[PDB]
Design a protein around this ligand. Structure first.
Ligand SMILES: [Mg+2]
Ligand SMILES: [Mg+2]
Ligand SMILES: [Mg+2]
Ligand SMILES: [Mg+2]
Ligand SMILES: [Mg+2]
Lengths: 357, 357, 357, 357, 357
């Protein structure tokens, strides 16, 4: 039984003005943490985030809407609780910010079950390989070419052996020069992927694909908006590239629609908005049945457990490490999921209070 | 230019007995009102609502996330404001409660543009016919048959010449009897429609359609969950009934998916969650293009102007009046869009004040 | 209420040299103007046109077939009037010249509603951005290469930063050279588009696309006849170009067919033949739903308000000004929708009087 | 680490000569048990079965082929071990008896992880509801009508509130009489399903569907052979019944093909041949994404844990209970998954030695 | 009538160096031989094999599960025996190793029918051309480039005029160089084919095809896993190569699925796992109907009769001879089906005796 539910909202400012083709200027993201305590004193940690806005909304959803489905409920019945939450925020929801709220709670619940069973999540899930390959995702669209190469250098220095840069400049010519620059800087066999962050039109995306073909990019992420199934399927049929998407899909059905329609070739769910580990693994299954690999977006410290428990995973995005007790370190291109009970992530809530809103 | 944005949340208490198949019992809905004031001092009224939960979150999005797109902006550029609000709440959004927040703002912006043009919105939208036909939607699933008939007479007494009743009782035999009763009670020629509120499985919905076919129901609403395009299309090919849906669809794309796949035969958008008049009208256009009629869900006071401006509308659902000054009356099965500037809705903020949270 | 409807036909003389691939040489277009007056004395201006023939017939439909739906009718119910005119000319109609007649009336009705609301139409439609980007469409197929470049400079001189040229010369080798010349002349970064005016066969259009791909054309317009849904869709899958079309589509259904089949990638409706603003806006909604941009054909003076009210517009074609009072100027590649009540177009009926037939 | 792997084969004779439309005469099924012991003394139990033949083959596969992938391996990495097993028996396998062998081992591995974590599997998986609805499946095709009704009586007496009888007699007339008899014996609202065990041709199956329509059967199982995707999809489109299948599908891909093709409406995997709990949950996810319910075939004492951890489960088949320590009892139509660590199934291996082959 | 059925298992030791992308290193294959004797004393020889594992299980199915369908049965009714063996091993079978067991029996039954008719099988099947063209399939992935060329010359030295090499090295750059080398080495006009053994992902396979296109490979075999119909069909539309597959398909239905979906362009059945000659011929018929050529995998000694009896055969794979009496020789790129009664294969059971397990 759940006896306590603490929801907290923090505004974590960023070290650099990270920027892209649509989200604009990221100067601070909103962190929402959820701590669930059972009748035995154990406390599971869960959390999600937004960029610039929507944070207070998510936190309010957990604190005012979901709480009533948690207090007094058996915390070991996660699937049961998930459905009850899905239905509580269904009216006017069924997607949107409500899924982020749910994801945070869901993550907390699994953390709790992992602690109780005295075993890491990647094992609780079944367990494949705790060593997960990674890549660094820069939010460098406005970063000058030279600064691009520099950042590239630090990523390498930091153990990363695969990099993703932003694209979607007004003039495709500028993207072609920058991508060309890093392909020469990084070298022929270096895994380099791009993310247009929904910036292109269907025709534009395909046009950009022909132009970037020479550089053998590992993949193109979110060429256009995610909602257009027909357009994305067209971009898949015509761009001769791996098409990654999923960070903006928020339900199992969105992934199901995309996969069935073939509007993406590489599923990229975000455990913190897809519905937690619960829905993430379901999406993972969908991918496996469709003979596709599986990558991820955000909170890799939490995500490492999911990918360590699936056989078809590939380069995980591992761009808050300051507030963490023992954050994972990247070695020769990979990370290792810890073996502590649960997900093993511990946040310095004392130092965080400094940033509460 | 916009100089003021006032957001208020109200807990309107709902009588017992209001129940359906999946949401459970309607305790109380939460009204999120948005009043906008521009340089010249005119104010526009817009509002949305939720059943049971999510209200505080809706209000939070407007007051905290959207206000920044309103204050200081030219209120005459509704479309511009619409797109900027869609993008401000896009991360973790792109659907969900955020579209309800957006609708509220949109609706108030149109009201303001109408107030300024000194014309009712139905005329400002184009102008078809201000006399819109209606029906009464009962939230009566757990309502004893006898009472159901009593409710029927009360609706006829109120001027309604079309009635919808809930279905989806655990055992199909119960729905058949109740439906037979009202059919028997109203006479076969009286438009009777049923709402399942997503209660049935695909097979179950098809199985229920065979069972109800004898009664010649005008339509079956939300036979199963809305997310299932394939399943809902199967229900369309096999049930021999008009299939209504759309109250739970929250983007123009959802409607595009549903229509393109033929997963429904009659689009039922809700102006207060679909994106306000702005998006509602774009959905109406899709329905016209596809040779479909157009119905609606909720806040008929605001919606009347929408359907009074499109040629293919049909029975509007018109089940909060105590708080209004000049609520439309139901006469001979129709209502009439008032000709006052804007949508013509006036709320008693004094009496509502007593219910703020 | 409508009390007057004045229909006039004018033979505006067109200079030699204006030529394309299938229509031959532009001798003179025929302007059909419709001025409507209501009870209060306000007048609304609407108009359409044809190239070479059909003018007298267009005028005849309005003056003889439609006047009966106008005189005595409430001019504020545009949508109602629209549907009744569609049906009055439905037998042997349902498309064709009759939609041009209908557009003329529709356009004047909107102008009247704008005049009455004391607001420019772009704001009355919603309001996005009054600064609409443009391009110059040359009717220059038989124009010597040299002259073609001279025409180019004249367009830059006029403020245009995007240019369309005709293609479809009997021998593909001619189109390639000419296109290479202007590409060479304008610089690769300058938006250059080509219009074939339905000249090519399906195979030929695909064959021409391979040939022109080197020049990175912004788009290819009407590669073959518009009636061929299957063929046009094949051109879309195989040509690697943005495919523009719609000037010859005369109903919302035509646009629905084309979009649903993906027989074009960029809808190009003509407000004066598609059904006026009423239908134009419904087509815009289809384009938005399908994640497509929206361009246009003809009478940019009237069209500017349409595209200035939709979020996905793109370069508007803005090639009759001598007869206008305050014609928009082209500045830095854009034009600006005037803020005068209605569409703001004023014609010199004195000077036009000299050309009546 | 796995230190021991014991494979045993038993011929469990049946209490009655159970019979059906294709498998013929079942006088004894082959039980294959697998006991995996780790470096801590814990022992996980896993098992599968065949009917009449194939037993020695499966056992041989575990003992001679899979053992080498088990001895010395970390037993906590189940996903890792599954893939290695899938690949070890891939050549000439990739389906078939190899999946049964793998399922037995897989089940053992999860049992082991459940014991180690001191928690029942239905909870380890996430946990939905330990109370799972059930139905009794008779292998009564040759059973006289009177004996049919009698058996029906014992099932009721035994707590079952849903029954499945065999169909697929040479003359559809005999099936229609028997089904008619039990529908009258059991009553109108009694859940009665049929299983043709692949006996009908596509046309025959559809013909039989029309004939059995009057009796409102809960579902028709395996109308034709499972391999025919096109034919089954046709039976689904035309029989107006829930179509259950899956017991003969042996890989995630088979289920994926069926679901995508719509050749079945209710997935029915058998945890003991699909690949264990590992693949069973993946199939479960596929079903959830496709808005389908989920049922099962065989070994319900093991299966109860899977269905207790999914939200979309329905009537579980719960037709060896003699050799079990504390077999579950059916109460008012449902069973309850035990809370002992692992799956909680304990076999009397001493008494079983009596039946070893 | 059948009076004897002798099943033997042999561990034939395989040299080091034999390696591919997914199976790893070929240690040793397991030969399962089946000798059948009828009333008149004639004996028919049939056999199958596995790589590394599954052998003992194959033998067990024949010896224990199938013998009951052979002894006492009329050996002249091959089709009858075929269907009864398919059904005896259907539970938990319907594919997998069981089809290999069935093939062994089937092959021996045909041999016996040929021995009795005193005619080679190729003539008994119809009779097309006994001179079947061939190619050499190297199991050479980890083989140094230099050695690869050396292997090439050895194949030319052996009479082969077509060569297949393995691909799927972790880094695509390695496959390109090696392929370039052999292309360079053999001359562009020499048929060179590559086998990936299911190593690539759908995107990867398409990416590899672009890379290898310069070399004009005769075909690409098993680009990804065979179970993925959708993915394999995508590889077909996008790779511009002949796509070979079928060695891992174990039923006529698998081939039907693949063909119907166009998930491969060239069917490659293996007579020893597809179901023997009986099923092999039915697969050939599907290939003829679909205007496809037909190739093969494994035991060319037995297969030669199949392809020598069909009109659309192409290069047969002809990489166990030491154990044969009169092994066909490779001359000028072809082999010739012997005209001895049956398949004409004779094994040295003395020398094989030394390898039984
Ligand atoms: Mg991204
Ligand atoms: Mg409803
Ligand atoms: Mg044109
Ligand atoms: Mg069954
Ligand atoms: Mg091969």
């Amino acid at each position: 039984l759940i006896e306590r539910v603490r929801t907290d909202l923090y505004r974590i400012p960023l070290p650099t003005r990270l920027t892209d083709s649509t989200h604009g200027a990221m100067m601070d993201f909103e962190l929402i943490t959820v701590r669930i305590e059972d009748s035995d004193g154990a406390t599971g940690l869960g959390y999600t985030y937004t960029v610039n806005h929507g944070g207070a909304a998510v936190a309010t959803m957990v604190d005012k809407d979901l709480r009533g489905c948690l207090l007094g409920a058996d915390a070991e019945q996660i699937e049961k609780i998930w459905q009850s939450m899905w239905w509580r925020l269904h009216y006017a929801g069924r997607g949107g910010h409500a899924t982020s709220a749910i994801s945070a709670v869901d993550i907390a619940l699994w953390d709790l079950k992992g602690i109780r069973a005295r075993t890491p999540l990647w094992k609780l899930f079944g367990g494949y390989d705790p060593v997960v390959p990674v890549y660094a995702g820069g939010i460098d669209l406005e970063l000058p070419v030279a600064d691009l190469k520099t950042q590239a250098d630090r990523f390498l220095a930091g153990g990363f052996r695969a990099i993703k840069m932003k694209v979607g400049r007004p003039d495709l010519k500028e993207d072609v020069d920058r991508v060309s620059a890093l392909r020469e800087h990084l070298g022929d066999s270096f895994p380099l992927m791009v993310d247009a962050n929904m910036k292109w039109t269907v025709d534009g995306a395909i046009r950009a694909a022909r132009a970037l073909a020479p550089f053998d990019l590992h993949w193109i992420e979110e060429p256009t908006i995610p909602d257009d199934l027909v357009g994305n399927a067209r971009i898949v049929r015509e761009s001769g590239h791996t098409i990654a998407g999923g960070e903006n899909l928020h339900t199992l059905y969105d992934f199901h629609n995309a996969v069935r329609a073939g509007s993406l070739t590489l599923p990229e769910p975000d455990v913190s908005n897809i519905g937690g580990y619960t829905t993430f693994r379901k999406v993972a299954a969908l991918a496996e049945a469709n003979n596709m690999l599986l990558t991820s977006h955000g909170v890799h410290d939490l995500t490492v457990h999911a990918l360590a428990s699936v056989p078809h995973r590939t380069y995980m995005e591992a761009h808050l490490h300051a507030y963490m007790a023992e954050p994972m370190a990247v070695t020769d291109g990979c990370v290792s999921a810890p073996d502590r009970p649960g997900h093993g992530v511990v946040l310095d809530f004392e130092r965080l209070g400094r940033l509460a809103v």
